[PDB]
Every structure is written in C-alpha cells, then in structure tokens.
Design a protein around this ligand. Structure first.
Ligand code: MN
Ligand code: MN
Ligand code: MN
Ligand code: MN
Lengths: 609, 609
C-alpha cells in the first residue's frame, strides 16, 4: 500500500489537488490511500468529487483543519499559501499511530512517473535517517540572491518541502512535537516571521539535527521558479519524474526550456479523467439486469450513471440576509451556448448557480475565458458546478439537480440559459416572495415567457413599453409556432390588463417557469436529453397540491439561438419518441401508486387526448 | 526503432489509420517507422496528414499500390476490405531489403499497451519459427459454426492475421515468395474463392509448414465477434494489450463486456492529438528571432503556425467534364454554423468544399451527425476538409487557403457559409464563365451581396420579385448600418435596370464575393480572425489586372446569424484594433515593395482618409 497526505485549502488548491491526483493516478500499480488536510468548503467539494470518481483500490480520508488551525496560529506567516502552509507541521497529531510511513505532497506538484518508485525509497534509509527531502534548487537560503537578505538558518543550499517522505512511525516515539515546537519558538525571538511557512522551519529543524534527513537526489523535485538551475539536475526526458512550481506566477514562469515543462503540465491536465476507472456494488447489480433488447436500454443504462461533478469551480462567497426569502436562479449550459453568459450576468444581481457539462480540454477553455473577461471576476457570487462529459445522451435533469442541491438561499427559480430577465427582476421577486408569504404554504410563482426574432434589439424598461413592442409585432408568446400548449393557457390577453397576481390550475402540456422553496422535488432522472425535461416536474409539483401564482409585472424574453443535436435526435427516429412515451406512462402508473386517486386526473387526460 | 506495416485502401481506411496510429503513438517510448501501402487517394490523404502532424522521432514511408495491384489480381476475393487484403502477402517484395523484422497490422487494430512489448517477442524465436501469430479466437476454421460451411484447411482453430510478426531477412533468404505463390494456386484449384482474403492464404502456409509459426499468448489480440470466446482469454484490465474489431457492424457488436471495450475505443477516437505532438528546424528558426516585447508578437507567432489537416473526411467522388468551366465554392465554418449546410446543399448542385475547423471530439460528433442526416449522406460530391484546433486566434486565411489548394475543378467561388445564393445558380454561372471566356483573359466575376433579418422568409426565385421586395424593402444592402463602404460602392442602384454584366475599378474597402480561376493568389497569413481579410484578396486580385465583372441576374440572401467571439474581442480589445492598423501598414508597404508604383495608390488613399 502507498499512503500520502496533502494539505488543501482554497478553491485554487482544490483544483490543484484534482490535477495532482490525475497526474499521480496516470502511473499507478498499487492501491493508494490519500489524506486531505482540508477545511469545510474543500472537504465538502472533494468528498462528493471522490465519491463520484469511483476509483478502485483507493481510499481517501479528510482531516479537518479548522479545529487544528490554532496549533500553528502562534507562528506568523507571510507565504501566499497562508496559515495552511504550517499545517505540514502537525500531521503527527492528526494522523493516528496506525500508519508508519507516508508521502506528503504540496497541492501544486504534478507527478510525471509512478509514485511506487518514490515509495520504494522507504527501505533505503539508514540508522536515524527518518525524514526524506530534496535539496532546494534556488539560492534563497544561501543569503546571496540580493542585498540585505537574512533567510532562516539551514544546511547548504537548503531543502524544499515539495515532497516529504516520512517513516518509522518514529516521529512520535521520538517526541517530534516538543522539539519542533521548541525549535520554532527559538527561531522566532530574533527575526519577525517565517518566509516559506513550513519550508522555512523544517530547514532549521534539519540544521539543528543534521542526521535525521536523507538527502535524496536533486532530480526528484524539479522546482520551476525564476532562480532555478535544474538544467544541471535534468538531462533528458527520462531524467524527469516530478515537477514543482514554487512561484505565485505558476503558469507564467520563465525558464530556458519552459516549453517542455508547459507541455508536461498540459499532458496530464488534458487527460479525460473518466478513462481512469480501470457505493459501487449497488450500481453494478442494478446495471446487471438492464435488458439490451429493451427499447429503452440506452436510457436505462444512462440514468443510473454517475458523472464527475466539480462543485464551485471558481471563487464563491455569499453573506446571508435576515429576510430568509432570497431566490437563486438555476440553469443548464454547455460549450455550444456560453456566449450569452455575460448577458445574463449583467441582468441578474442576486446569487446564481449554474451547472456546466464540459469535456476536460473545453473545461479549461472556459477557465481561460472566465479568467480573461472582467465581468465574471467583478462578481464573486456566481457558482459554477461542472459535471464532466460521459456517455452520449444529455442528462439535463442531472445538472439541474446538481445546481438545485447546493444553493445558499432558501428559494430558487427554474428557467433556461437561453432566456433573459428584466433590470431588477431579483428585487421584484424578493418583494413578491415577502408579500405572498410562501414561508409556510406550498405555493409557486410563475414568470411569463416570450420570444423575439431579431438579434439586435434594445432592452425594454417598463411594462407599457413591453406591451408596445408586443403589439408592434416584434415579440410573441414563447413557443407560439411549435409547442403552443406550453404557455397558451396563461392567456396573456387576460394578463395584459392584470394589476394583481391571480392563481391558475394545470392544463394539458402546461410548462411554466416556477419560483419555489428548496424542498421542491428533484427532477426525475430517467429522462435525459431534450424534450419533456420540465413538464414532469410540473406534474410532480401539481399532484402535491402546490398552487400557482402568475406575477403581473415580471417578464422574461428569449434570445435567438441555433439548434443542437438534441432537438435533431428528438426529430430523427421514432424509437426515441416511443421510449419517451413509455417512460411517460411508466411515471404515471408509479406516481399513481405512490399517490393514487389524485393521479387519475392526468390519466383521464391521456384518455381524452 | 520498431517497424510497422499498414494497408490503406479507401476513405474508410484513411480514417481508421488515424486512430490506429494514434493508439500506437500514445504508449510509445522508442522511435517508430511506418510503411503505409496506399492507393492515390489514401496516399495523398495520409501524406498530407503526417506531414502536418510534425510528430517527433517518427518516420513514415508510403508505398504505391496501383503498381503492385496486379500481383494478387489473379486471386478472387470476397472480403469487404477488397483486393488490398491479399496484398498483405507481397510485403517481402515491396518493403526494402535493408529491413529485418516488421509488425504487420490491419487498420482496425487498437493498442492498449506499448508496441515495444510486442516488438520484444522477436527475442524469443527459436528453431525455424519465422512467423509470429496467435490462435484464432473463433470457430470459423473449425467448420462447426453453421451447416454447410467449408473453411479452408488450417491448424486447429486457425489464425487471425490482424497482427503479423515477420523476419523479412529470412523470408527473403529462404525462398518465401515462390512457396506462398505455389500454395496460393494449390489451394484454389478445386473450389471458387477464399472467405477471409489474406487471413486465408496465411493460414494455408501456416498449415502446410507448421514449424514457422510461434503460438503467441491469446491476449495479444482479443478478437471480438458475434461468437467470441475471449472471456477465458482475459481476467483483468491490465492483462489486455490489443483488440481486433473483426465485424462489419464494427461498433454495433454485443458482448459481455462490450461496454468497457467501446469506452476504450472512444478513449483514443476522441483524444486530443494536438497533445500527441511530443520543416521543424526552419519553423523553429523563424520562431527564433521573434521578440516578445513587440507590439504584435502574438500575430507573428500565429503567422507560420501549422495546423493539422485531415482532408476528405467522408467519401468524395467527382468526374471532371469536358467543358472545363466548372466552379466550386469555398467557405470557412465551425460548429456554430453547421445547420446552414443543409440549406446550401438544397441550393447548390455541383461540388463544394468547406474548410471545417473543429477539434477532434467535435469532428467525431460531426461525423456521427453527418452519418445520420440523409441529405448530407446522399451527396457524394461535397468535400469536407477539417483543420483541427490549436492556439487561440482564428486562422481564417489558413482555412480558406487549405480549401483553395485542393480543388478538383479549374475555377472556384469564394464566400462564407453565411450566404445562400439562388436555386439553379450552378448552370447560370457555368454559362456565364463560358460566355465571358476567362480561359484566356484575366478577369473576376462578382455575384450580388445583400442582407435580411426574416428567418422564415419565402425564398425568392426571380429578379423582378427582388425588385418588388426591395421596393417594399424587406432586406437591405449587406452591412448597411456598420460598414457602409463595404458594399455601397458597388452602387446597387444601377444594378436594377442592368441586363448585362458591368465592370468596376477598385475603391476603398471594396470587399465583394468573387469567382476566379485556380491561379488566383494565395492569402496573407498575417491576418487571422475577423476584419480586413477579404479586402486583401480583392486588392491583390485587382493589381493583377483582373477586371471586376458584376453579373446582372444573380444574387445572395445573407441568412441572419448569431455573434461570434472574434467580433466581440475586436470590438472590446483596442490593442486588437491598433494591431490591425499596424498590420495594414506592414501589408501596404510589402505590397509597395512587391509591385512598386502601382501600389502607391493605396498609400495615397491612406493619406487622403
Ligand atoms: Mn508549492
Ligand atoms: Mn429555444
Ligand atoms: Mn480486421
Ligand atoms: Mn453575418
């Protein structure tokens, strides 16, 4: 068995840990056991990520850091990592005595070869040589990079904490705790604070006792920074196994042959991690009896699938409000449709949770785009949950549920990414929510839907101006030429004169856009793709005696968009339609079973139609 | 320096060898040397690809098959591959005498492990074991699959020729040609023909002399068919090394673990080959003097960038006519503008080209979709030249010139997929070219630009009705609200009353759509993206004393389309605009130097404006 421990904190390092994990997994032979010293947010994200990865012969265990933040709090730090840099100092207190030797990797490492070869070095230590480390490739500790430099004392050039190799389960038998605490206290009275966090103190702990360390080969930790001489430490491609990026620039580091290093960085990150799979047994014995001859075999197989979800891709933050009535949009988006994102961002003020569906490479494409555009960065309160690509269908309900569950306000709005709201729709929905008093009853609010057929139009301001455009003829009701029954029962002719909200019942194929509490039912997953992805939720919410209210002054208007293959596959072959109807009626019978007489209504409708 | 031999024949093989070479190259660790025996179309396709791939430490040599077709012409065959399967036995004559041992692989093979391990088996041959094969994993040769089956004689279950391991040196030495020829005729005297082409003759020469074979372990090629028995021939993922998909259904087969095998197949069919990249010296030295402190170094970096081109993705066939006055379109496009292709297919009748610009995964999705639509499939004579993505900019000029160079008719028509000229325009332009007789003079024909914003517009048919709908004014001159000088200088006013074509000189920012002979100049690579792209061609075309002729009776209807990302960057990035201006100055002075006084006019215009 190979064991390893990584400190994780912040969204950036959570991403670094995912890249490191795929790099390591590329060359595995043996079972692996990780230990992530993580805070609350990173733990929440990575638990789900690793629970959905389904990797065999891997066990991942997370150790809280908030409780153990105080252990090093007395040591001031200036490293960009923060207080979490010193967390590499108290692993013995966290990791139980059950283990004997364990790797320790910083989040930025990217393994180029098998980690078993590194694990091999745990039988090459002599006598009291317990700690494994590699010599720093810079001249930071030598005190000669620039005038008036006073680095912490160390032996020779100093050693870098990129890769730590522990062993003997001796650090407890030798009382490491007291000595390191005493060393740290002694090395803080003269100078101000640490410079490299753990790497700053460990070097001193090496100097005061030179014989614990085992001076590994330099070409083990090929540090990449502005003052590296690794060209002596590396000769060819095969002379390279593990690379570090010990600069805040990271991707913007400069070297003589940095091109090959950038290649070696994108060689693992680009890999589609869904091909690394060579809570489970349940999935196998449900997939086992899926009849291939069944007309819905592909759908049945797809429904049970689990896809790699990476919650909170970019930095997120939200200060809760006392009104406890805030709403948050939900949308499903793909890389064929991301251009109008900014349009939507400028038209929403409250928190919004999306759910992307990307393919690794494209995922990164989106990363570069978002890191370029200033509009997304100016806004800190937008989530990004990317459920990576897998299979051939479009599990839209999956992504909608993923955006549903992780939401920081009690209320939510269901819509599509192709639409667009007014200026201040957030505020009006807050007022309407606080007025209709949905805190107790199970009621829903509906925002009417329209569409337009001209790319470059101005954005209306008021209701009168809107109805002016409508009768001018540039706008119509949503789906007024393909699926008329979707919104026709709203009979906007009635709404035009409306001044207070009014309630409506359900009509055939009646698919509005709802604002609802966080307890609303999850979308039924058997249906994936395009078509009948919303109406099922509507009939679910209706059989549960949820009333509908249609807001008089709110509206939302569709922006033209090109078609995708989902609608084409919805119009291609009759088998897809037959399977769709099959699942429809299946849902009706089972829904009746769980509720009964109330469901007969819908059944009668199909008899009438 | 492993040596491989692949038979290529037909467009399907041309597209399978890409995935096979991808698979082999993914796990490479030592230099490789291919030998592709191909006909004219496959030779051109594969020559063009590798030459563009720029893979290092890999050598590729192509051997003609037309000259060597006759060798096996006397052997009737029934395999779907064709007569090229039998050609697998003439390799001794075709391959050079300086080689010793070669791995002969069919197109369908996929390598799960490095071919170095397979090559290593050439250190385990003893006695007179000169061939290397594996036992067939089917019951074809056993004569028991069904009633009235008479397989050719073989040793036991038989052998599958998917993978052949040879020792050229010997087979030459010990008289291989004559004995396989003698066996070939000896086994064809009684009955009609073979059942598996080369897989039959090899089996025959395996049976007659059992001392040449070497019974490799079963797991060197896991044959998958409708009656496979490979379940006992593997236990885990690691053991598997190579898979043969011997079935006309290919990916539609059914097996116990067909899902995992299909996932592996899709792993490399969708892998990003632009990562696999790890003529060269010259490109590097051009990149040498490039300065990163320059105003527009990004443009210089992109000017000579080489992109992977896979010409003629799908079947293509076209017989030139005796008139020698045909015209073919050219137009760039990507994902976002695919659906228009059908409309143009319903408009044009003769051959077209399109420099489709997508990644690998998007290319595969397009392949499936185009294999779905009946209209696309039924049209044989439409090329599809695909250039994969790399870098950040949009090398529109590169796409258009890749479409330019490879055209199978004398004259050509330059446009974008954003236009949809009339119905029957093919014969009209044929007669126009015939009558104006460009075959001798140097002239450029022009068809009418325009623009509309009505997606559901009945398609016009005749000039007078356009006169009417301009009188009522449904659609306006193309780009009448952003760039008036783009097409207003054509003075559409006089077009209406004209009945014969009229000639026009050059004006500022005149960017029409032209028809011209193949000889027309290539584009300047310096301009990549949107903006000041076609005017370069128009000015260069004009200075070569090409008379601009405007056809009286033709016309085009711009189909409204969504905004792209390049235009957004151009409108947002001022540095882009300034770099456009400096590129214009550079091009103007290069124009001056390469032609002299005649090009001063542009400079004067730049001074006047
Ligand atoms: Mn670091
Ligand atoms: Mn739509
Ligand atoms: Mn085959
Ligand atoms: Mn356009």
């Amino acid at each position: 068995t190979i064991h390893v421990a990584i400190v994780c904190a912040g969204y950036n390092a959570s991403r670094d840990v995912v890249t490191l994990v795929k790099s390591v997994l590329f060359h595995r032979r043996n079972p692996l056991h990780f230990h992530l010293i993580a805070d609350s947010i990173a733990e929440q994200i990575l638990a789900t990520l690793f629970q959905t990865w389904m990797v065999p012969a891997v066990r991942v265990d997370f150790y809280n850091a908030d409780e153990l933040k105080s252990e090093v709090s007395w040591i001031p730090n200036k490293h960009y990592s923060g207080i979490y840099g010193l967390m590499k100092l108290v692993l013995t207190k966290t990791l139980p005595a059950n283990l004997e030797r364990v790797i320790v990797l910083d989040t930025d490492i990217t393994f180029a070869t098998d980690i078993a070869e590194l694990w091999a070095v745990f039988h090459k230590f002599k006598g009291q040589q317990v700690l494994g480390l590699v010599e720093n490739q810079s001249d930071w500790y030598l005190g000669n990079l620039w005038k008036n430099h006073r680095p912490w004392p160390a032996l020779g050039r100093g050693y870098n904490t990129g890769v730590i190799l522990l062993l003997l389960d001796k650090l407890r038998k030798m009382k490491w705790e007291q000595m390191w605490r005493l060393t740290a206290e002694r090395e803080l009275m003269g100078m101000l604070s640490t410079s490299l966090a753990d790497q700053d103190i460990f070097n001193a702990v090496i100097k005061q006792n030179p014989f614990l360390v085992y001076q590994l080969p330099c070409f083990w930790n090929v540090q990449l920074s502005d003052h590296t001489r690794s060209e002596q430490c590396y000769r060819d491609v095969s002379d390279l196994k593990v690379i570090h990026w010990n600069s805040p620039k990271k991707l913007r580091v400069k070297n003589k042959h940095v091109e090959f290093f950038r290649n070696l960085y994108l060689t693992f990150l680009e890999y589609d991690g869904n091909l690394l799979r060579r809570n489970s047994e349940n999935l196998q014995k449900q997939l086992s009896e899926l009849d291939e001859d069944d007309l819905c075999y592909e759908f049945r197989r797809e429904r049970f699938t689990v896809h790699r979800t990476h919650l909170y891709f970019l930095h997120y933050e939200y200060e809760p409000a006392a009104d406890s009535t805030d709403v948050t949009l939900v949308a499903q988006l793909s890389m064929d449709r991301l251009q109008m994102l900014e349009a939507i961002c400028k038209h929403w003020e409250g928190p919004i949770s999306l759910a992307l569906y990307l393919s690794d490479a494209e995922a990164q494409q989106f990363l570069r785009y978002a890191q370029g555009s200033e509009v997304l960065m100016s806004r800190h309160n937008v989530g990004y949950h990317i459920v990576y690509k897998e299979g051939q269908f479009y599990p839209v309900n999956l992504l909608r549920n993923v955006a549903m569950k992780h939401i920081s306000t009690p209320y939510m709005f269901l819509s599509d990414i192709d639409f667009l709201p007014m200026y201040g729709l957030y505020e009006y929905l807050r007022k309407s929510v606080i007025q209709l008093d949905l805190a107790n009853t199970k009621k829903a609010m509906i925002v009417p839907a329209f569409e337009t057929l001209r790319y470059r139009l101005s954005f209306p301001k008021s209701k009168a101006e809107l109805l002016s455009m409508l009768d001018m003829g540039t706008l119509f009701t949503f789906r007024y030429h393909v699926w008329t029954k979707g919104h026709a029962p709203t009979n906007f002719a009635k709404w035009r004169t409306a001044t207070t909200p009014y309630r409506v019942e359900w009509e055939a194929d009646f698919e509005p856009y709802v604002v609802v509490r966080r307890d609303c039912p999850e979308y039924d997953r058997r249906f994936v793709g395009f078509g009948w992805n919303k109406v099922a939720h509507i009939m679910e919410l209706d059989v549960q005696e949820y009333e509908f209210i249609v807001l008089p002054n709110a509206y939302m208007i569709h922006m033209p968009h090109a078609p995708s293959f989902d609608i084409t596959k919805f119009r291609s072959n009759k088998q897809y339609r037959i399977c769709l109807k099959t699942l429809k009626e299946e849902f009706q019978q089972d829904m009746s079973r769980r509720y009964g007489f109330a469901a007969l209504k819908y059944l009668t409708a199909e008899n009438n139609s």
